Design an enzyme around this catalytic site. Structure first.
Site, short mmCIF file in Angstrom:
data_model
loop_
_atom_site.label_atom_id
_atom_site.label_comp_id
_atom_site.label_asym_id
_atom_site.label_seq_id
_atom_site.Cartn_x
_atom_site.Cartn_y
_atom_site.Cartn_z
N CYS A 1 36.72 43.82 36.99
CA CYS A 1 35.49 43.05 36.83
C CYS A 1 34.36 43.58 37.67
O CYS A 1 34.58 44.05 38.79
CB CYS A 1 35.72 41.57 37.05
SG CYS A 1 36.90 40.85 35.90
N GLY B 1 41.18 43.55 38.38
CA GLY B 1 40.38 44.20 39.42
C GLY B 1 39.19 44.99 38.88
O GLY B 1 38.35 45.44 39.65
N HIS C 1 31.86 34.84 38.66
CA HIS C 1 33.21 34.30 38.80
C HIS C 1 33.96 34.82 40.04
O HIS C 1 35.06 34.35 40.31
CB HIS C 1 34.03 34.45 37.51
CG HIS C 1 34.44 35.85 37.13
ND1 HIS C 1 35.42 36.53 37.84
CD2 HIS C 1 34.10 36.58 36.05
CE1 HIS C 1 35.60 37.68 37.20
NE2 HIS C 1 34.83 37.76 36.12
O1 LIG Z 1 39.50 38.13 32.17
C1 LIG Z 1 39.73 38.22 33.37
N1 LIG Z 1 40.25 39.32 33.95
C2 LIG Z 1 40.30 40.66 33.50
C3 LIG Z 1 39.28 41.37 32.89
N2 LIG Z 1 39.42 42.54 32.25
C4 LIG Z 1 40.63 43.05 32.16
C5 LIG Z 1 41.79 42.43 32.68
C6 LIG Z 1 43.12 42.88 32.46
N3 LIG Z 1 44.20 42.23 32.88
C7 LIG Z 1 44.01 41.09 33.56
C8 LIG Z 1 42.79 40.55 33.85
C9 LIG Z 1 41.62 41.21 33.40
C10 LIG Z 1 39.63 37.01 34.31
C11 LIG Z 1 41.02 36.43 34.61
C12 LIG Z 1 41.49 35.59 33.44
O2 LIG Z 1 40.60 34.49 33.19
C13 LIG Z 1 39.26 34.80 33.12
C14 LIG Z 1 38.46 33.87 32.49
C15 LIG Z 1 37.09 34.07 32.43
C16 LIG Z 1 36.55 35.20 33.01
CL1 LIG Z 1 34.84 35.47 32.93
C17 LIG Z 1 37.34 36.14 33.64
C18 LIG Z 1 38.73 35.96 33.69
#
Ligand SMILES: O=C(Nc1cncc2cnccc12)[C@@H]1CCOc2ccc(Cl)cc21
Ligand SMILES: O=C(Nc1cncc2cnccc12)[C@@H]1CCOc2ccc(Cl)cc21
Ligand SMILES: [Cl-]
Lengths: 302, 306
Positions: free
Chosen positions: B145, B143, B41
């Site tokens: 990920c 950030g 992603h």
């Molecule tokens: O989850 C995600 N972001 C994060 C991960 N972990 C912690 C966080 C905390 N706070 C904001 C963001 C975060 C991203 C952005 C949201 O939409 C999606 C949708 C699918 C996927 Cl695979 C990723 C994301």
């Protein structure tokens, strides 16, 4: 989201851990630049431990009585001196993995990461707090002496603890990296006991602010309190007094959540009175006191 | 003495963390040998996430669209390919700090250390378990990920998790290092939720053995139970079923403490049915399920990882 007991990444400290042997005793040492720091009780046998005269025991050792092993390499000890309860062994090689570092003496309530080691090899990393009674509730077995506690705020490792001993209640005592013990402890096998411990109030308040930041408000109430009335109540539950310094320190978290510090104090007063009534706060059924205000800001979203 | 939620030393993994940037998105990558692994992603805009065709989005990128930074050095991307939900960026330099490693897919109940990273810089290390509902109760901000989870078995790092997303309840979802999600999750901004979770029974028993080893015995009793009667109580309290494999795995702890596994099950049955009566176990008022039997043995024996 989420809130975990989080330690600093330990790699910078792993590259400093060495094994120190003097006679039959083996423990851990911290190798920074050309010096290896370790508990001075490495020169004692189990017999010497009741009333060791460290100056007399040390004068009898030569450099070659200290065996320092860094991985699979034996370092050469070229000098030795004692500073308080720490022995400093000068070695002929500067540690190429020496990070940017400082030695900091911490106050009760401060937290730090511990890299538990055995035979100069790291076993695990966990987060600790210096208790109000100057002990730490660590996880240490025989051979863990010389394991260190540290923080790594902004690339510099601040070493704040070196492990020396386990007290009869299973809690731990140690020194700063200048060899000064935290608390009224001595590196002697004479009868010693941890004093009555108390809860670190400022940290519990910081953790309640973390819970509010993470979306939980169930424990808040419509009340406020004076600082003195809060302290009169909190001390009945064996909580440390909350000072104006603690109130000032909680200012940023108070501004972020919109909950005045004395309003959060009223919530804490009510939690002490009522318990949690089957609820949890950040996955805990007890009030957590091993997160400082600084740890909450570092971990939580802004 | 003492019993802490302990993570593995993270140094071997810290030497693999890099920053991966694609357009406006920056996240973490894992640099092993000449490949940087990261969530696929990284190539998506917020609108692409609504319904991404990853093959189509990737065909539009060139190697130079991926900026990989290892500390203060920019690596050169010379190839890119996708494996499931992970993007693999071939770089022109093998990581000189690549530890001995394997990619392993873990099962629910297994624990691992997470090295939380931001901008390719490790920020913290914590321990967690793969929940029975395939989520992890992590601590991750925007950030994070591409941050990874791992275990160390002898001198080998077993990478088992790469962070991809946060679900609405604040719990986390990710993949193994082959890009296969743990749980029924997809890498798309669409309605997703963590299923109802259960407690990892074998881990609670392991932690009760850890408590006995550390001197807490108030919960012990004279009773024993059958595995079937214990499993009827486990089902009632949203605990995972205890299998004969779990009993066998707890054998060493049972022999050390002198408390048979089914004898400890009768203590757990009583704790579930009656609560703790104002008491705590290892400083907890809840039954802890994020220590495996191996974690308990390792922590109580002081196993090292040089
Ligand atoms: O989850 C995600 N972001 C994060 C991960 N972990 C912690 C966080 C905390 N706070 C904001 C963001 C975060 C991203 C952005 C949201 O939409 C999606 C949708 C699918 C996927 Cl695979 C990723 C994301
Ligand atoms: O505490 C010590 N050993 C350990 C440290 N930490 C954890 C452990 C766990 N289990 C056994 C031992 C341990 C040593 C030995 C005991 O008597 C003394 C007395 C003073 C001093 Cl400075 C050290 C020691
Ligand atoms: Cl301090």
């Amino acid at each position: 989201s989420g809130f975990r007991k989080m330690a600093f990444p330990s790699g910078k400290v792993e590259g400093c851990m060495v094994q120190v042997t003097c006679g039959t005793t083996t423990l851990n040492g911290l190798w920074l630049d050309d010096v290896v720091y370790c508990p001075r009780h490495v020169i004692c046998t189990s017999e010497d431990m009741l009333n060791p005269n460290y100056e007399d025991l040390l004068i009898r050792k030569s450099n070659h009585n200290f065996l320092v092993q860094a991985g699979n390499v034996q370092l050469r000890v070229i000098g030795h001196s004692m500073q308080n309860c720490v022995l400093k062994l000068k070695v002929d090689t500067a540690n190429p993995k020496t990070p940017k570092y400082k030695f900091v003496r911490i106050q009760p309530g401060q937290t730090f990461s511990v890299l538990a080691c055995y035979n100069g090899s790291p076993s695990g990393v966990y987060q600790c707090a210096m208790r109000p009674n100057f002990t730490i509730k660590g996880s240490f077995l025989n051979g863990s002496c010389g394991s260190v506690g540290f923080n790594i705020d902004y690339d510099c490792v601040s070493f704040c603890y070196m492990h020396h001993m386990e007290l009869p209640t299973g809690v731990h005592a140690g020194t700063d990296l200048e060899g000064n013990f935290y608390g009224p402890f001595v590196d002697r096998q004479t009868a010693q006991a941890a004093g009555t411990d108390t809860t670190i109030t400022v940290n519990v308040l910081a953790w309640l602010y973390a819970a509010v930041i993470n979306g939980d408000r169930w424990f808040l109430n419509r009340f406020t309190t004076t600082l003195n009335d809060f302290n009169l109540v909190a001390m009945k539950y064996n909580y440390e007094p909350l000072t104006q310094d603690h109130v000032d320190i909680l200012g940023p978290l108070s501004a972020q959540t919109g909950i005045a510090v004395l309003d959060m104090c009223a919530s804490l007063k009510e939690l002490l009175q009522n318990g949690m009534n089957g609820r949890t706060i950040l996955g805990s059924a007890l009030l957590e006191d091993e997160f400082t205000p600084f740890d909450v800001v570092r971990q939580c979203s802004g």
